[PDB]
Amino acid sequence: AENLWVTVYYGVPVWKDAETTLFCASDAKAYETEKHNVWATHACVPTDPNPQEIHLENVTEEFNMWKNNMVEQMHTDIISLWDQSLKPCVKLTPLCVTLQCTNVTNNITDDMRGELKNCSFNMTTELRDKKQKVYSLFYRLDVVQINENKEYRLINCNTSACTQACPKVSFEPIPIHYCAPAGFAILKCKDKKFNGTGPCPSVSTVQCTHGIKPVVSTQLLLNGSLAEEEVMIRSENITNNAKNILVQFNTPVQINCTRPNNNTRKSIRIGPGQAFYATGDIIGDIRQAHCNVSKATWNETLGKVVKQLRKHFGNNTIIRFANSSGGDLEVTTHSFNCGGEFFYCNTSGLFNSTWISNNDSITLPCRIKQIINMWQRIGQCMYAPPIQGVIRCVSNITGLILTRDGGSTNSTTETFRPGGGDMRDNWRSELYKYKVVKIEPLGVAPTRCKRRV
Amino acid sequence: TLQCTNVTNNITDDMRGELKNCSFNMTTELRDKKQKVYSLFYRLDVVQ
Amino acid sequence: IRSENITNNAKNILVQFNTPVQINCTRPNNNTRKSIRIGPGQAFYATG
Amino acid sequence: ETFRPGGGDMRDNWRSELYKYKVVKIEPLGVAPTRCKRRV
Amino acid sequence: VFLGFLGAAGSTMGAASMTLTVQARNLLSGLTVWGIKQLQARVLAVERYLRDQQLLGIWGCSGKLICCTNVPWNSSWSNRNLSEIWDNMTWLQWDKEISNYTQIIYGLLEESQNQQEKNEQDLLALD
Amino acid sequence: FLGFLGAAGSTMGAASMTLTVQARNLLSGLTVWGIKQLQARVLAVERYLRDQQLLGIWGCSGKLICCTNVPWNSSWSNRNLSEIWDNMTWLQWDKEISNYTQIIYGLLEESQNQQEKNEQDLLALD
Amino acid sequence: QVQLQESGGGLVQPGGSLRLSCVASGFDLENYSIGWFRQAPGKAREGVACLSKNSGIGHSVKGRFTISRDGDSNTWFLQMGALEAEDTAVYTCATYNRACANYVTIWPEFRGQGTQVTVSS
Ligand SMILES: *[C@@H]1O[C@H](CO)[C@@H](O[C@@H]2O[C@H](CO)[C@@H](O[C@@H]3O[C@H](CO)[C@@H](O)[C@H](O)[C@@H]3O)[C@H](O)[C@H]2NC(C)=O)[C@H](O)[C@H]1NC(C)=O
Ligand SMILES: *[C@@H]1O[C@H](CO)[C@@H](O[C@@H]2O[C@H](CO)[C@@H](O)[C@H](O)[C@H]2NC(C)=O)[C@H](O)[C@H]1NC(C)=O
Ligand SMILES: *[C@@H]1O[C@H](CO)[C@@H](O[C@@H]2O[C@H](CO)[C@@H](O)[C@H](O)[C@H]2NC(C)=O)[C@H](O)[C@H]1NC(C)=O
Ligand SMILES: *[C@@H]1O[C@H](CO)[C@@H](O[C@@H]2O[C@H](CO)[C@@H](O)[C@H](O)[C@H]2NC(C)=O)[C@H](O)[C@H]1NC(C)=O
Ligand SMILES: *[C@@H]1O[C@H](CO)[C@@H](O[C@@H]2O[C@H](CO)[C@@H](O)[C@H](O)[C@H]2NC(C)=O)[C@H](O)[C@H]1NC(C)=O
Ligand SMILES: *[C@@H]1O[C@H](CO)[C@@H](O[C@@H]2O[C@H](CO)[C@@H](O)[C@H](O)[C@H]2NC(C)=O)[C@H](O)[C@H]1NC(C)=O
Ligand SMILES: *[C@@H]1O[C@H](CO)[C@@H](O[C@@H]2O[C@H](CO)[C@@H](O)[C@H](O)[C@H]2NC(C)=O)[C@H](O)[C@H]1NC(C)=O
Ligand SMILES: *[C@@H]1O[C@H](CO)[C@@H](O[C@@H]2O[C@H](CO)[C@@H](O)[C@H](O)[C@H]2NC(C)=O)[C@H](O)[C@H]1NC(C)=O
Ligand SMILES: *[C@@H]1O[C@H](CO)[C@@H](O[C@@H]2O[C@H](CO)[C@@H](O)[C@H](O)[C@H]2NC(C)=O)[C@H](O)[C@H]1NC(C)=O
Ligand SMILES: *[C@@H]1O[C@H](CO)[C@@H](O)[C@H](O)[C@H]1NC(C)=O
Ligand SMILES: *[C@@H]1O[C@H](CO)[C@@H](O)[C@H](O)[C@H]1NC(C)=O
Ligand SMILES: *[C@@H]1O[C@H](CO)[C@@H](O)[C@H](O)[C@H]1NC(C)=O
Ligand SMILES: *[C@@H]1O[C@H](CO)[C@@H](O)[C@H](O)[C@H]1NC(C)=O
Ligand SMILES: *[C@@H]1O[C@H](CO)[C@@H](O)[C@H](O)[C@H]1NC(C)=O
Ligand SMILES: *[C@@H]1O[C@H](CO)[C@@H](O)[C@H](O)[C@H]1NC(C)=O
Ligand SMILES: *[C@@H]1O[C@H](CO)[C@@H](O)[C@H](O)[C@H]1NC(C)=O
Ligand SMILES: *[C@@H]1O[C@H](CO)[C@@H](O)[C@H](O)[C@H]1NC(C)=O
Ligand SMILES: *[C@@H]1O[C@H](CO)[C@@H](O)[C@H](O)[C@H]1NC(C)=O
Ligand SMILES: *[C@@H]1O[C@H](CO)[C@@H](O)[C@H](O)[C@H]1NC(C)=O
Ligand SMILES: *[C@@H]1O[C@H](CO)[C@@H](O)[C@H](O)[C@H]1NC(C)=O
Ligand SMILES: *[C@@H]1O[C@H](CO)[C@@H](O)[C@H](O)[C@H]1NC(C)=O
Ligand SMILES: *[C@@H]1O[C@H](CO)[C@@H](O)[C@H](O)[C@H]1NC(C)=O
Ligand SMILES: *[C@@H]1O[C@H](CO)[C@@H](O)[C@H](O)[C@H]1NC(C)=O
Ligand SMILES: *[C@@H]1O[C@H](CO)[C@@H](O)[C@H](O)[C@H]1NC(C)=O
Ligand SMILES: *[C@@H]1O[C@H](CO)[C@@H](O)[C@H](O)[C@H]1NC(C)=O
């Protein structure tokens, strides 16, 4: 009692905040009958058949969404898994001879006037001696005029050269789990009214994350994870005009679309072993790909979003939406992916309204590009090979990345326009209720012991 | 095969010879056309 | 004066000084580098 | 006696800065006699 | 029972000193991506565990979980009642309170252990 | 106070006080500076584990001074007592006994085994 | 810090050209892209140029105005030609989003003070 003596305790529940490297855990799904994936999960280990979560209590731990290292750890794994899966296949440099292109007039519609082009050029055959005359169909977004049947040129044999995508693999996303190594724990906040930089007095611990799809989109999140109750508004600091507003939906909105044009890929040879799959002969009419959304759902989802959003900007304000006002070609237009073909739809029929304080469907035209430059860098691209038949995609609009304009002193004319930028807000919307903690077990405490000799 | 000639632009007897004009054909960014460029090459980097 | 075995004719004799001996030099010219195109992306910078 | 400058292997520019150094592996275990006996 | 990793992290210190085994049993569980990434952590974890074990062994300890020791409380680190410490706070609060008095303690413990070793060694001589 | 290897010039008698200093840091802490560095962080832990296992099997595990059976044989070194512990350094001791440190490592193991069997049978009998 | 320092203002005879430029530092001009303002009395704010990072593209709202850069030097040159009577305003250079997100409408942070450009015979 009157004597107080130190005592060393091992393995007490004490943790600190730190950073480390997490690893794969993907569902097996047999995986023997697989057509490979660019996000190769064969290197990843099999996952737990049933993850177990332990509910904590009495503990309130502060979180943070905008200063999380998990996001920056993920963005250097998708890129690294992308560069690794484009190395062992064709590396076509000899495709930028002076193309001699002309127009196409095979039963076209005035909406798709121009666009497709009949290009014709010379290639080196498998023998290093002879040359062959080939022809192809090239979209207007992949050829530029030179020397102003005028000669054209691929937009890319001016700054870089690109490797045609490996034709066996597919761009299908698959769920992936991120699990921490031994000696660390994954804290997860289970409160339904989380708002970003705020403590969760319900935090539990989990073996590791739930399956999260590495989808890629812009200004409209697709196939995301919804939220309970009502739509949620998150931001870094919502008083500024240079910070995004990551809206999260409650009731999903279905969007679906196709490419109504038959396409027959044809293969030609450019060397020993290597092949080049170019498009030729569109069998049928010529129409433009367009995406349909249901008006009866958007007409109420925008209303719910504005009702929730009017909290931070006063009650007597006129919220007004608008379309993107300019920028790059990846930010100002929807840029999703659908079965190996990259659409660039033009969303200006949605962000069109004005809201005061007191069956029909919407169609969005689209364009197709083949010389993609995702993971924005300088010195790479990827010729996406043409695919046969007509593809259809049905997708789930659970999100929005609106940004403000403001700046015009104090008034009530708040306008919101969609906007992207860094492709890091598509993963800060799925890894927001997680943090990684390092356990420090050794501890010291006073008690009534002596350690008699 | 470089085609090279001498340099006689305000030369100094200590640096006689040495530098050489050298013209040659180079492939442009397109795999079809050829340029015609020139450069100045020291006498220690070219052989007859 | 350091050496591996200083009585031989095939072993270096490393000498370490006491006071530095300053040495200057410069190249009394202006070369201007021009850039020409080799192919897709690559460039070659050649004196001009 | 005539002296002439001369190089050779590109290894005498680093034998002039790493000359008063060496690396040693420390072996801790030791044995010595003293006046005990482990009492059971 | 109330098992699981970090299960009693919210429980009081009185009942927290019963699951020390659970929180210490799994401290050592076990050229493309998912390659050297795993191997960069599977060595760090081993090094951390070995360092903790060596630190525990330097003092008069390594029985394991609970270990008595000399060097009494300085009475200035915490002017709190014993029942105050052991029945109302949690381990996280205790760490926050004594996060920054430990450095001298980590040397006091080892010097006490060395003194005890010398006492035993020179006592085992005259007999 | 002193530091790492600070008593390596001190006498044997005063050297057996800083054993903790020279024992606490045996576990300190692609491209070049990649796998080459990673080799050392594995070799060090392997050496430390081997040393601990040796300080194990003999019967000790308390580290530092741990004095034992297997009485000294005069054939190894016919010297006095104060001659060893007050006018020598550990390096000189290693030089004197370097070839004889191979039979002791075998005697200690069997002594420990005998002690363990004696204790076990004595305990299990009653 | 990041604040932008501008220079090159003056008076122009209709049918001429300018070399407006602005230079800044602050250990953070790697995440941002620098564009330009345009404010005439009685009118709102517009945009004139935005040199987007990640693409090197030289977006502009009118054909005459072009933005440009040179090497690693932290200076940006706005080249304008064939000015008319309507190009009399206050020109400011500010920092926009990393991919030149919405301009000609946004009001950015880390903005400059602004030179003066007047046109008349
Ligand atoms: C969001 O999730 C939906 C649901 O999985 C994705 O739609 C799916 O897209 C794939 C790829 O085009 C479709 O697979 C294809 O199925 C056809 C018919 O079986 C088959 O012939 C093809 O070889 C290919 O396997 C899948 O059917 C389709 N799901 C449904 C219900 O139609 C969608 O792609 C996801 N969003 C994004 C942006 O990827
Ligand atoms: C695009 O161009 C190709 C070749 O320039 C056209 O193919 C020609 O089709 C006619 C009949 O319509 C044949 O008589 C020619 O022999 C074909 N050319 C060659 C080189 O074989 C093609 O019709 C054009 N249009 C489309 C839609 O492909
Ligand atoms: C959120 O953003 C607002 C932007 O208005 C920040 O307020 C500005 O803060 C800077 C630096 O303190 C001042 O120079 C400005 O005058 C402030 N603006 C206004 C209108 O007051 C605010 O500080 C940000 N919040 C946080 C936590 O950083
Ligand atoms: C998205 O595709 C789905 C399925 O093709 C469409 O849903 C069907 O729409 C028709 C309209 O005539 C209904 O008769 C069907 O009952 C619907 N299917 C189901 C399962 O209910 C949907 O219309 C498409 N999206 C839009 C905006 O039209
Ligand atoms: C956003 O919407 C506006 C108007 O709805 C678009 O402005 C038109 O753009 C076209 C394309 O150059 C012009 O031909 C029209 O004259 C413009 N109309 C007006 C009234 O200015 C604008 O292009 C849309 N932005 C995007 C990115 O789609
Ligand atoms: C994106 O969609 C908008 C919405 O229709 C397009 O804006 C119209 O474009 C046509 C094309 O000539 C013009 O005639 C109209 O005046 C435009 N405005 C309206 C209200 O219809 C726009 O052109 C599309 N494309 C781009 C690149 O913005
Ligand atoms: C190196 O070669 C160039 C080109 O062959 C020479 O430049 C020529 O200079 C004369 C006058 O001195 C001009 O009339 C020619 O038009 C130039 N050629 C070209 C292609 O423009 C140059 O004189 C030579 N010598 C040096 C030292 O540069
Ligand atoms: C240093 O170099 C001298 C060379 O002059 C070595 O002396 C020679 O040793 C070889 C082998 O023992 C004899 O065959 C020569 O006859 C010796 N030369 C003379 C002049 O006597 C000397 O051994 C070298 N030092 C060491 C330590 O090896
Ligand atoms: C090396 O020393 C020589 C001689 O001292 C320098 O040559 C002089 O250069 C100056 C500057 O052009 C002339 O005014 C003198 O007439 C030169 N003297 C001569 C040629 O005897 C030379 O500049 C020095 N080089 C350095 C310092 O880099
Ligand atoms: C061919 O298409 C181009 C599109 O750039 C158009 O300008 C041109 O008028 C068209 N010519 C014919 C003959 O269709
Ligand atoms: C392809 O090569 C032939 C060789 O006879 C040539 O006549 C033709 O113009 C070439 N086509 C081009 C350069 O588009
Ligand atoms: C080629 O790329 C450069 C950028 O390096 C660009 O400025 C130019 O417009 C492109 N097209 C040409 C030179 O025809
Ligand atoms: C989240 O809620 C907390 C509650 O105090 C508030 O301080 C913080 O600013 C909020 N963050 C937002 C609205 O982004
Ligand atoms: C989209 O809707 C239009 C008219 O509402 C219809 O003609 C078209 O076939 C639809 N497309 C898809 C893919 O649903
Ligand atoms: C597209 O072409 C294939 C093969 O010629 C054919 O089976 C299919 O019916 C075509 N699609 C349409 C919509 O005509
Ligand atoms: C649909 O949009 C109109 C136009 O702004 C609006 O008046 C109406 O309230 C919307 N529908 C709902 C259910 O809010
Ligand atoms: C929305 O677009 C329609 C035509 O698509 C147009 O009549 C209307 O004016 C637009 N909304 C606003 C606020 O201008
Ligand atoms: C889209 O949302 C609907 C409604 O909740 C859901 O049934 C469907 O599975 C979602 N699509 C996905 C997850 O691909
Ligand atoms: C050119 O330089 C070479 C260098 O040896 C020399 O032999 C030759 O005479 C020179 N000729 C002229 C015309 O300068
Ligand atoms: C470069 O090519 C042209 C082709 O017309 C040729 O006449 C000339 O001799 C070449 N230059 C050389 C080989 O130095
Ligand atoms: C260095 O000095 C020692 C002193 O005994 C001498 O034996 C040795 O030969 C010397 N080494 C040289 C001069 O290289
Ligand atoms: C050499 O060339 C540069 C390039 O224009 C020029 O500015 C400079 O004045 C010239 N002379 C010297 C001594 O640098
Ligand atoms: C949590 O807090 C309550 C309220 O004081 C307490 O009764 C309980 O023992 C604490 N621990 C657990 C595990 O519930
Ligand atoms: C521990 O907290 C701060 C951090 O160094 C220190 O200033 C303070 O003095 C320490 N606590 C006490 C009670 O002295
Ligand atoms: C070194 O030798 C001297 C002379 O015998 C002795 O006094 C001293 O204690 C020794 N040790 C140290 C650390 O100086």
Author numbering:
A (entry chain A): 31 to 141, 150 to 186, 188 to 309, 312 to 321, 321A, 322 to 398, 411 to 505
B (entry chain E): 128 to 141, 150 to 183
C (entry chain E): 272 to 309, 312 to 321
D (entry chain E): 466 to 505
E (entry chain B): 518 to 547, 568 to 664
F (entry chain F): 519 to 547, 568 to 664
G (entry chain J): 1 to 52, 55 to 82, 82A, 82B, 82C, 83 to 100, 100A, 100B, ...
Task: Provide text from the study.
Broadly neutralizing antibodies are proposed as therapeutic and prophylactic agents against HIV‐1, but their potency and breadth are less than optimal. This study describes the immunization of a llama with the prefusion‐stabilized HIV‐1 envelope (Env) trimer, BG505 DS‐SOSIP, and the identification and improvement of potent neutralizing nanobodies recognizing the CD4‐binding site (CD4bs) of vulnerability. We have previously designed an HIV‐1 Env trimer BG505 DS‐SOSIP, a highly desirable antigen that is conformationally fixed in a prefusion‐closed state, in which neutralizing epitopes are almost exclusively exposed and non‐neutralizing or poorly neutralizing epitopes are hidden, even in the presence of CD4. HIV‐1 broadly neutralizing antibodies (bNAbs) target vulnerable epitopes on the envelope (Env) trimer, such as the CD4‐binding site (CD4bs), V2‐apex, V3‐glycan, and fusion peptide (FP). Cryo‐EM structures of these nanobodies in complex with Env trimer revealed the two nanobodies to neutralize HIV‐1 by mimicking the recognition of the CD4 receptor.
To elucidate the mechanism by which the potent and broad llama nanobodies recognized the Env trimer, we determined the structures of R27 and G36 in complex with BG505 DS‐SOSIP by cryo‐EM. The cryo‐EM reconstruction map of R27 in complex with BG505 DS‐SOSIP was obtained at 3.6 Å nominal resolution from 315969 particles. The refined structural model revealed the binding of three copies of R27, each to a protomer of the Env trimer, at the CD4bs. The epitope of R27 covered 715 Å2 on one protomer with a minor interaction of 21 Å2 with a neighboring protomer. Indeed, R27, G36, and J3, as well as the domain 1 of CD4, are all bound at a similar location in the canyon between two gp120 subunits. The approach angles of R27 and G36 were different. This and their different sequences resulted in differences in paratope‐epitope interactions between the two nanobody‐Env trimer complexes. Overall, R27 and G36 bound at the CD4bs, in the canyon between two gp120 subunits with quaternary interactions, mimicking CD4 binding. The broadest neutralizing nanobody D188_G36 (21/25, hereafter referred to as G36) and the most potent neutralizing nanobody D271_R27 (geometric mean IC50: 0.101 µg mL−1, hereafter referred to as R27) were selected for further characterization. The triplicate format (nanobody x3‐IgG2a) resulted in more potency improvement for R27 than for G36, which is likely due to their different binding pattern and approaching angles to the CD4bs.
